[PDB]
Amino acid sequence: GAMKNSFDRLIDGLAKDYGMPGFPEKKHEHEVYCFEFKEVSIRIYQDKFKWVYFLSDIGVIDNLDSNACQSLLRLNEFNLRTPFFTVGLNEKKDGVVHTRIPLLNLDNVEMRRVFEALLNLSGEVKKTFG
Amino acid sequence: GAMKNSFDRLIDGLAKDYGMPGFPEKKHEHEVYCFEFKEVSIRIYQDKFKWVYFLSDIGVIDNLDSNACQSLLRLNEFNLRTPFFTVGLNEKKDGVVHTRIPLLNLDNVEMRRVFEALLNLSGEVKKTFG
């Protein structure tokens, strides 16, 4: 309800600064909404239990496997930071970085930060492991 | 408030089934509570902004390569599952698996499941990568 309006402002806002989003098909279960902002390779999903998700695609990375795999999977070290960005590998060895956050009592302004934060992180990660 | 009583029941309950917890020192910033259940190698932290955390230590990485490391960092694939368990590497190449969840409107019963779920996962991950 208040969460709906909040989630809307988020979207509305990203549309104005990244243009119209794309609307992929219901892939995952419990999924109810999915907006794809292709310019920045980020997808926003909304759980059926009111959780918003941010998925970013870093892209492909060749070689380096044993090389830096660790330093990569080392980015998942524990810490008490809000919106933690998990770094993982796609179903085809492709860079992927996401987060999830309940919508209850979370305004669009923070969701934007989370989003932006996610962008920047994808940047930094992209320009290191290629 | 209601979150306090909730978090308490969680703890109280784990105490009864895993005995007295340990109380490490304020390591991370924003940290306010930390309970260590050494029997199961899991630590529970509580953010200053009302987020509960579950940290599990898989232990020593004796052998690591790139068909293993990947398969590991492959456990972080995206999906719309509640309480997502991030698998990462300690500050000394040591197995580590954690999650975080806001306390607002979350009962101790679900928190337990999350906990238990985390245990089992640490199990499965432990008996495969060591």
Q: CATH class of chain A, please?
A: Alpha Beta
Q: How much helical structure, as a percent, in the residues of chain A?
A: 25-40%
Q: Taking Cα atoms only, what radius of gyration of chain A do you get, to the nearest Å? A: 15 Å
Largest interface: A-B, 39 and 40 residues
The CATH architecture of chain A can be given as 2-Layer Sandwich
The span between the termini of chain A is 42 Å
Shape of chain A: globular
Keywords (chains A, B): Plasmid
Pfam families (chains A, B): CesT (PF05932)
Protein name (chains A, B): ORF1
Organism (chains A, B): Pseudomonas savastanoi pv. phaseolicola
Describe this structure in words.
Two copies of one chain form a homodimer. By secondary structure, chain A is an alpha+beta fold. Chain A has a single domain (1-130), classed as Yope Regulator, Chain: A, CATH 3.30.1460. In chain A, 37% of the residues lie in helices and 25% in strands. Chain A contains three helices and five strands; from the N terminus they run αβββαββα. Chain A has a five-stranded antiparallel beta sheet with strand order 1-2-3-5-4, with helices on one face. Chain A is globular and about 50 Å long. Chain A binds chain B through residues 28-31, 45, 47, 49, 51, 53, 55, 65-67, 69-70, 72-80, 82, 84, 86-91, 93, 96, 98, 100, 102, 104-105, and chain B through 28-31, 45, 47, 49, 51, 53, 55, 64-67, 69-70, 72-80, 82, 84, 86-91, 93, 96, 98, 100, 102, 104-105. Chains A, B: InterPro entries: Tir_chaperone.
